[PDB]
UniProtKB/Swiss-Prot annotation, chain B:
Gene encoding the protein: KEAP1
Protein name per UniProt: Kelch-like ECH-associated protein 1
Chain positions of Kelch repeats: 6-51, 52-102, 103-149, 150-196, 197-243, 244-288
Quaternary structure, from the entry: Component of the BCR(KEAP1) E3 ubiquitin ligase complex, at least composed of 2 molecules of CUL3, 2 molecules of KEAP1, and RBX1. Interacts with NFE2L2/NRF2; the interaction is direct. Forms a ternary complex with NFE2L2/NRF2 and PGAM5. Interacts with (phosphorylated) SQSTM1/p62; the interaction is direct and inactivates the BCR(KEAP1) complex by sequestering it in inclusion bodies, promoting its degradation. Interacts with NFE2L1. Interacts with BPTF and PTMA. Interacts with MAP1LC3B. Interacts indirectly with ENC1. Interacts with SESN1 and SESN2. Interacts with HSP90AA1 and HSP90AB1. (Microbial infection) Interacts with ebolavirus protein VP24; this interaction activates transcription factor NFE2L2/NRF2 by blocking its interaction with KEAP1.
Tissue expression pattern: Broadly expressed, with highest levels in skeletal muscle.
Family, similarity comment: Belongs to the KEAP1 family.
Impact upon substituting residue 59 to A: Loss of interaction with NFE2L2/NRF2. Abolishes repression of NFE2L2/NRF2-dependent gene expression. Impaired interaction with SQSTM1/p62
Modification after translation, per record: Non-enzymatic covalent modifications of reactive cysteines by electrophile metabolites inactivate the BCR(KEAP1) complex. Accumulation of fumarate promotes the formation of cysteine S-succination (S-(2-succinyl)cysteine), leading to inactivate the BCR(KEAP1) complex and promote NFE2L2/NRF2 nuclear accumulation and activation. Nitric oxide-dependent 8-Nitro-cGMP formation promotes cysteine guanylation (S-cGMP-cysteine), leading to NFE2L2/NRF2 nuclear accumulation and activation.
Source species of the chain: Homo sapiens
Full-protein residues shown: 322 to 609 of 624
Localisation per UniProt entry: Cytoplasm; Nucleus
Consequence of changing residue 43 to C: In a lung adenocarcinoma cell line; also in NSCLC cell lines; strongly reduces interaction with NFE2L2/NRF2 and reduces repression of NFE2L2/NRF2-dependent gene expression
S-cGMP-cysteine PTM sites in chain numbering: 113
Domain notes: KEAP1 contains reactive cysteine residues that act as sensors for endogenously produced and exogenously encountered small molecules, which react with sulfhydryl groups and modify the cysteine sensors, leading to impair ability of the BCR(KEAP1) complex to ubiquitinate target proteins.
Entry function: Substrate-specific adapter of a BCR (BTB-CUL3-RBX1) E3 ubiquitin ligase complex that regulates the response to oxidative stress by targeting NFE2L2/NRF2 for ubiquitination. KEAP1 acts as a key sensor of oxidative and electrophilic stress: in normal conditions, the BCR(KEAP1) complex mediates ubiquitination and degradation of NFE2L2/NRF2, a transcription factor regulating expression of many cytoprotective genes.
Length: 286, 288
C-alpha cells in the first residue's frame, strides 16, 4: 500500500476523465476521483506528495481546445482542484521536476509549436518562463538527470525529430546533445539508473517498439530490448528500479497492455492490462 | 461497341495509404484494375472534367514521410495513363471537391495542423490554380456538392468543433453564405447531389461513425432524414450513377469496409450491390 503508478486522462474515441492507480505490490487497480475535465496528451508528475496533471487537449460542450491547465490531485483527500494555469496552452507536453519545481516543456497551441518552457513554483502557485529550447518540440519526452533537464525528440511543426537537448537550470541555457538513432515523437522518456531511456513512439511512418537509452557517461544512444508492442503516445514511469509502460497507440488499436522492463535482465514483459485501452495518458508514482 | 460509364475509385487507406485505381461497371457488376497512382494516397477526392479523371489532395505515403498532398493528377481512361498537373496552392488532406463549368473547386482540407478555410479553382485549359473567396468556416473532412451551378460545403471539422453547418458558394458573385444546418454533426460524410437534393450520408458525429442519411431540399431549405445505410461508415466514397447513389468503403470504427451500397430514391431503399477487391476508405470517387 505504498507508492502507486497513477494514470490520468487519455483518449479512446474521445478524451477521457479517468484517474486510475496501479499497485505492482499485489496487482490491483484503483479508480480514483475523475479529472474535472477530460483531457488527452497531458503529462503527469508529482511533488510534495501531490499529483499534477499538466496541459493536453480537452473535450467540452463546444470545445476541443488545447489546454494550459495545471490541476492538483491530493491522494490523502482524493480531490482535484485547479492551480495556476500555464502561460499558454501546451498540448502534447513534456514535464520534468527539479527541486520541487515543475517544468512544462514544449507542446502546441493549435499550429503553434512551442519552444518556450515554464517553471511552476507550487508554494507560490506561479508560472514563470525560462530559456526556450533550441528546437520547437511537441510530443517531446522529458527526463531529469543530475539536476539537468533532457528534452527528447518530438515534432517541430515541420520535421519529426531525432534530436535531443539538455537544459542547465543554474546557467539557464539549453545545449543540444547527440541525437537518437531513430526519429521519435510521442515517445515515452524516463530516467533509470543514470541513463535516459526513450521507448516507442512514431518515426514518421510507423509506431515503434524499439527502445533507445542514453548514457551521459559515454554521451551516446544504444538500443535495448524492444517492447513487445509497437506504441506511441504511451505513458511511462519507473518504479523500484524497473520501467513501466502503459497504454499507447499501435497504429490501429489503443492498447491496454502494460509492459515492464528489467534493466538487469534486458527483458520486457507484460504485467497488467489497465482497465481499457487508451493513449495520451499522464503517468506518475507516489 | 460497349463499356459505357464507370465508377472509378482512386487511392484509399488500409493500414497504409493505397494506390489502387479500380472501375466498377454497374451494368454487368464487374471490376477493372487500371493504372496505379504514381503515389499512394488516401483522404483525397475525385472529380471528372472533359472525360478526364482528377485525383486531388489527400495524404501520400512516401518513404521519407507521410505528407499531406497538394497534388492534382489527371488520368486519361483512353490511355490508362496518370499524368501530373499543376498542384494546388497548399496541401489539402481530407479535401472536398466540386466541378462547375469545367473548373475544379478544391474546398478546405488540412495541412498537418492547418484546417483550411480557403478555396481554390483550377482551370484545365490553362493548368492553373487560383484562390477564390474563403469559406465562412474552416472545414476538413468536408463534403462538397454542386447544385444549380452553386457549390455546397457540408459538415466537417474546424479544428475544435465538429460541424453540422453547411454553406453555399456563389461563383459569379464569388461569395459564401451559411445555409440551414444538418440534423447531425457530420465529418467525413459522403456528400452528393441527386434529383436537386443534397444528400449527406454517413460520417462521424464526434462519437460514432454514422449510418444515418439526410438530404437537403434547396426549395424548402430543409434537411430530411431518409433510409439509413445498412453499414455505419465515415470517410466513404460516394457518387451518383443512373440516378442512384453508390457509397463505397469507409471506416465503421473497427473495420475498413469493402461493401458498396446503392440507394434507390424511388423506393427509399439501400442494398449491397457489390464489394471492392479489398476493404478501404478515404477513396476519391468519380464517374465517366
Amino acid at each position: 500500500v505504498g507508492r502507486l503508478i497513477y494514470t490520468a486522462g487519455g483518449y479512446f474515441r474521445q478524451s477521457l476523465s479517468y484517474l486510475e492507480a496501479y499497485n505492482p505490490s499485489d496487482g490491483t487497480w484503483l479508480r480514483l476521483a475523475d479529472l474535472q475535465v477530460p483531457r488527452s496528451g497531458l503529462a503527469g508528475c508529482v511533488v510534495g506528495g501531490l499529483l499534477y496533471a499538466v496541459g493536453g487537449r480537452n473535450n467540452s460542450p463546444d470545445g476541443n481546445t488545447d489546454s494550459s491547465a495545471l490541476d492538483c490531485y491530493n491522494p490523502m483527500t482524493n480531490q482535484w482542484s485547479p492551480c495556476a494555469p500555464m502561460s499558454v496552452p501546451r498540448n502534447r507536453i513534456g514535464v520534468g521536476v527539479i527541486d520541487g519545481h515543475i517544468y512544462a516543456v514544449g507542446g502546441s497551441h493549435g499550429c503553434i509549436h512551442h519552444n518556450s518552457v515554464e517553471r511552476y513554483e507550487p508554494e507560490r502557485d506561479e508560472w514563470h518562463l525560462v530559456a526556450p529550447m533550441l528546437t520547437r518540440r511537441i510530443g517531446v519526452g522529458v527526463a531529469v538527470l543530475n539536476r539537468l533537464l533532457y528534452a527528447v525528440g518530438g515534432f517541430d511543426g515541420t520535421n519529426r525529430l531525432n534530436s535531443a537537448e539538455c537544459y542547465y537550470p543554474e546557467r539557464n541555457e539549453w545545449r543540444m546533445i547527440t541525437a537518437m538513432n531513430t526519429i521519435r515523437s510521442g515517445a515515452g522518456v524516463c530516467v533509470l539508473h543514470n541513463c535516459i531511456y526513450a521507448a516507442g513512439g512514431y518515426d514518421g511512418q510507423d509506431q515503434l517498439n524499439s527502445v533507445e537509452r542514453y548514457d551521459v557517461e559515454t554521451e551516446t544512444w544504444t538500443f535495448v530490448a524492444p517492447m513487445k508492442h509497437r506504441r506511441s503516445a504511451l505513458g511511462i514511469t519507473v518504479h523500484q528500479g524497473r520501467i513501466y509502460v502503459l497504454g499507447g497507440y499501435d497504429g490501429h488499436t489503443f492498447l491496454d497492455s502494460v509492459e515492464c522492463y528489467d534493466p538487469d535482465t534486458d527483458t520486457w514483459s507484460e504485467v497488467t492490462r489497465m482497465t481499457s485501452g487508451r493513449s495520451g495518458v499522464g503517468v506518475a508514482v507516489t
